Design a protein around this ligand. Structure first.
Ligand SMILES: Oc1ccccc1-c1ccccc1O
Ligand SMILES: O=C(O)CNC(=O)C(=O)O
Ligand code: NI
Ligand SMILES: [Zn+2]
Length: 331
């Protein structure tokens, strides 16, 4: 078995290898990359996402989110307080202000220490889930707005045509902005390109050990667990690497820098934080290997999760027994 320790693997495709997206995902899996839950892909030196990022300041962040924490330094939840709209130029200025800017630090490890020590005492503002793309339309390789759709994958594999669409989202981050422990909707893959700015640190649990993380989360967030059998779908819970280690949860960590792709694999729990002002683009995707994960994916039906239009068909076709209860949750 390849990659039996479930290490995060890093890939350096050639420009020739970078032509066929599906083929390269399959290649990574042949080397055991999926066992980690997360892989890094460094594009060939000849590749670029777009010419420059000099003209992005007028993009609107319609609903910036202030991420307010509750709990203790290593075990906390966050809720999102809506703020007034601002442009990316305004957001960048805010990120760089004395109140929100990255503190002096020695290296990534020092900054990680500061993050887990001090995150809960601040409330950074995140411009997340903005529909759009920063890939040039002429970028033919690994263009996240030109991937095969999940709906077409399901049709190719299972023979049924379904409604729905599948487009990328932009994320503008600042120091301490946080993504909570989660797997993707319907335990899909995700791919994330860091377009510009400061790094993003990721934590990930191997898919074969996801239930260990779920069990710990139930113990650490007991009220939340009683409220919903799949409350990590709410994407509000954080657990530090120290607490994971104390509880014997297998995980890995890696820092993504500008110009690098990350892929998360089906049922790979992940969480992390941004180092400073940055912009990432991400989208979900599927492969034939995903179908069995989609069939088995947990669902939130308590009403909190509330997801895309397109998830309806996934649940309807892959999980018909769960569909009625889930759909009630979506109203
Ligand atoms: O300076 C900016 C102003 C506005 C939007 C983006 C940038 C930027 C783009 C790439 C790299 C760094 C940057 O700060
Ligand atoms: O970048 C973020 O804030 C969160 N991204 C993801 O969870 C992802 O790409 O799957
Ligand atoms: Ni994700
Ligand atoms: Zn729920």
């Amino acid at each position: 078995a390849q990659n039996p320790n479930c290490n995060i693997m890093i890939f350096h495709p050639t420009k020739e290898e970078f032509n066929d997206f599906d083929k390269y995902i399959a290649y990574m899996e042949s080397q055991g990359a999926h066992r980690a839950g997360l892989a890094k892909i460094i594009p060939p030196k000849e590749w670029k996402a777009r010419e420059t990022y000099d003209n992005i300041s007028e993009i609107l962040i319609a609903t910036p989110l202030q991420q307010v924490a509750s709990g203790r330094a290593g075990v906390f939840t966050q809720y999102h307080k809506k703020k007034k709209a601002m442009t990316v130029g305004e957001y960048r200025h805010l990120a760089n202000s004395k109140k929100y800017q990255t503190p002096p630090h020695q290296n990534f490890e020092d900054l990680e220490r500061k993050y887990w020590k001090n995150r809960i005492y601040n409330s950074p503002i995140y411009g997340a889930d903005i529909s759009g793309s920063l890939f040039d339309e002429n970028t033919k390789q690994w263009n996240l707005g030109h991937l095969g759709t999940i709906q077409d994958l399901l049709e190719k594999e299972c023979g049924v045509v379904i409604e729905g669409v599948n487009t990328p989202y932009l994320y503008f981050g600042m120091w301490k902005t946080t993504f909570a422990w989660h797997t993707e909707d319907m335990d899909l893959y995700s791919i994330n390109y860091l377009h510009l700015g400061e790094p993003k640190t990721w934590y990930v649990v191997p898919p074969e050990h996801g239930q260990r993380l779920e069990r710990l989360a139930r113990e650490l967030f007991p009220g939340s667990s009683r409220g919903c059998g799949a409350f990590l779908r709410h994407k509000v819970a954080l657990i530090s690497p120290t607490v994971l280690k104390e509880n014997g949860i297998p995980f890995n960590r890696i820092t993504q820098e500008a110009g690098e792709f990350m892929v998360t694999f089906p049922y790979g729990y992940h969480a992390g934080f941004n180092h400073g002002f940055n912009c990432a683009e991400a989208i979900n995707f599927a492969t034939p290997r995903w179908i069995d994960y989609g069939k088995m994916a947990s669902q939130c039906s308590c009403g909190e999760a509330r997801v895309t239009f397109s998830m309806d068909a996934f649940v309807r076709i892959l999980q018909p027994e769960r569909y009625d209860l889930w759909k009630r949750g979506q109203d």
